[PDB]
Structure formats: C-alpha cells, structure tokens
C-alpha cells in the first residue's frame, strides 16, 4: 500500500494473509467470505508467464493478523487449504480477465474480535455503491513504494469513470474489472502495490451499515504513478460463479 | 447460498460496539 | 524477517 496509514486493531477482520511454507514468505492478500471460504486473485496462485503455479500443499492461510512478521499467538489462526478453485475463463495470457479464485479451508475457522467475514454485494448494493467518485478501501502488507510495513496498511481510494480507466492503459479492459485512484489534478495519492494482490477493495453501505467487498486487488502499471490507476476484479459481476462453487462444493 | 451469513461486514470491535474507525467518515462523506 | 510458526502448521 503506497501512501497509506496503519490499520487499527480489528479494522479489517476479513483480511487474510496467503503465506508460503518453503521459503517462509508473504504471497498475497485474500479475504474471509464465510467460516470455510477464502477469496483471492487467481494470479496469486497461477501465472504461467512468471512460472507461478502454487498448489494447496504449498501454502497456508493466516487470518486475524495485524503485524506482518510476528507469529501473533492467541490472535491469528492458521489454516490448511482443502481445494483451490480458479475461474475457468481466467485470462493470464492477455489482460488478467476474471482474476478471481476461491479456496476451501480444511476445517472451519471460529470467529472472534479479529476474525469475521465481509459481505458479497447484491444488485441493490452494486447499483448504489459502485459509482465514480465514491470511495472504497484497500488493505494489505505489500510494498510501501514501487519498503515493507511492520503493520497492516489501509488507503481510501475513489472509483474512476470507465473512459478514464480505458484511456490510462494500453491493456484491454473488460467489464470484469474496474479502476480506482486519484486523478493527477486531485493532489491526493495512494495505490495498492506488489504484495497487496488478492486483497479486498471494500465499501461500507450507508443504508444497512455493512462492509461489502466490491473488488479484488488485481493489476496496475507501477504503483502510485500519475495518470495511472489500480485495476480491481469486479466482484459483483463474478458473484454468479462464487455462488456456483460454494453451493456445489459445500 | 446466498446473501451470506447474517454476520457479514459488521465488525465486533466497531459496528457491534457503535464505534467508528479513524478514516471511515471519508468513505461515507464521498456517498 | 518472519517469525517461525508452530511446526504443527508445516507438517
Ligand atoms: C507489474 S507491471 O507494472 O508490469 N503491470 C502488470 C500489467 C499487466 C500485465 C499483463 C496483464 C495484466 C496487467 C501487472 O499489473 N501484472 C503483471 C501480471 C500480474 C500483475 C501484477 O503485477 N499484479 C500485482 C500488483 C497489483 C497492484 N498494483 C496496483 N494497483 N498499482 C501493482 C501490481
């Protein structure tokens, strides 16, 4: 997270850390969606142009964390994965189209003050919240600049109009992505960066007062570059595939 | 299945205790 | 950099 600040304890109880067994390192961010399900980006697990192919036995899921490095004994909870579900139409070849993945936990995780799931949006929520100018929130332990924080980082970023997203890149944008960040003429800064990937982009509803995950930290050209925006996997558009796998696989 | 658990997006240390985090207002004022 | 996690999680 570039140009962000420290998170308060229990500010994102759905934030998950994707952690590699050997070598012991941070892989990605992720989010708790229920007691047995975790949402991430498919690129965290599978990206053939960079030789990335991580299976279930290669990693652990660390929920309830604040510190990046510490083993937070009676706060964090470590889970093994049962199965990884990568969207079948995930496009690693061209543009990271459909950069989404589901992970089933071996055993359910008990909730606490530090472990709680986030809501997935419905049609009502998406229509109300997913508008240009509205702010969302990104969290993670990734790079501070294009450098490693000791504690979870947060940044509030506004949603950008589809034409501005299309104009800022030479990559082919689809309706399964949205972009966020400040325009050069806005003065404010901030972006997600390497290590943040798979992490949630959330909005709080002013109606019910719930937190909804609208996006997944996907791609961007550099970090916090002027005239450049962070691209996020559109959660609502892909919600039909999330329901399919959760309902089919328990 | 479906809208999720009745629990979702309400934090035990914030919404449950009627407390706000430091930067929350910035989001709500944008709406 | 990272602290060692219990060996129960690695087996
Ligand atoms: C790392 S890069 O600057 O080369 N940008 C590529 C652009 C791209 C290439 C091919 C397809 C789609 C997008 C990218 O973001 N990539 C290359 C493949 C994976 C992804 C990545 O590095 N993701 C990590 C982060 C996410 C957050 N981000 C941001 N919001 N500025 C910076 C990159």
Structural summary, described in words:
- The complex is a heterotrimer of chains A (250), B (31) and C (11).
- Chain A is mainly beta.
- Chain A is built from 3 helices and 15 strands.
- In chain A, the strands form 3 sheets. In chain A, strands 1-11-10-13-14-15-12 form a 7-stranded antiparallel sheet. In chain A, strands 2-3-4-9-8-7 form a 6-stranded antiparallel beta barrel. A two-stranded antiparallel sheet of chain A has the order 5-6.
- Chain B is built from 1 helix and no strands.
- Chain B is flat and about 30 Å long.
- Chain B starts with 23 loop residues before the first helix and ends with a helix.
- Chain C has no helices and no strands.
- Chains in contact: A-B, A-C.
- Chain A binds chain B through residues 5, 8-11, 13, 33-35, 111-113, 116-120, 122, 129, 133-137, 154, 156, 158, 203-206, 209-212, 243, 246-247, and chain B through 1-5, 7-15, 21-24, 26-28, 30-31.
- Residues 43, 95-96, 171, 191-194, 196-197, 217, 219-223, 230 of chain A line the site of the ligand CS(=O)(=O)N[C@H](Cc1ccccc1)C(=O)N1CCC[C@H]1C(=O)NCC1CCN(C(=N)N)CC1.
- Chain A: Disulfide bonds join 28-44, 165-179, 193-223.
- Chain A: The active site is at residues 43, 99, 197.
Secondary-structure topology with pairs:
The complex is a heterotrimer of chains A (250), B (31) and C (11).
Chain A: E1 5-6, E2 15-20, E3 25-32, E4 37-40, E5 46-47, E6 52-53, E7 59-63, E8 77-86, E9 101-105, H1 123-129, E10 135-140, E11 153-158, H2 162-167, E12 177-180, E13 200-204, E14 211-219, E15 230-234, H3 235-248
Antiparallel strand pairs in A: 1-11, 2-3, 2-7, 3-4, 4-9, 5-6, 7-8, 8-9, 10-11, 10-13, 12-15, 13-14, 14-15
Chain B: H1 24-30
Chain C: no helix or strand
Bound molecules: the ligand CS(=O)(=O)N[C@H](Cc1ccccc1)C(=O)N1CCC[C@H]1C(=O)NCC1CCN(C(=N)N)CC1.
Ligand 0BM is lined by residues 43, 95-96, 171, 191-194, 196-197, 217, 219-223, 230 of chain A.
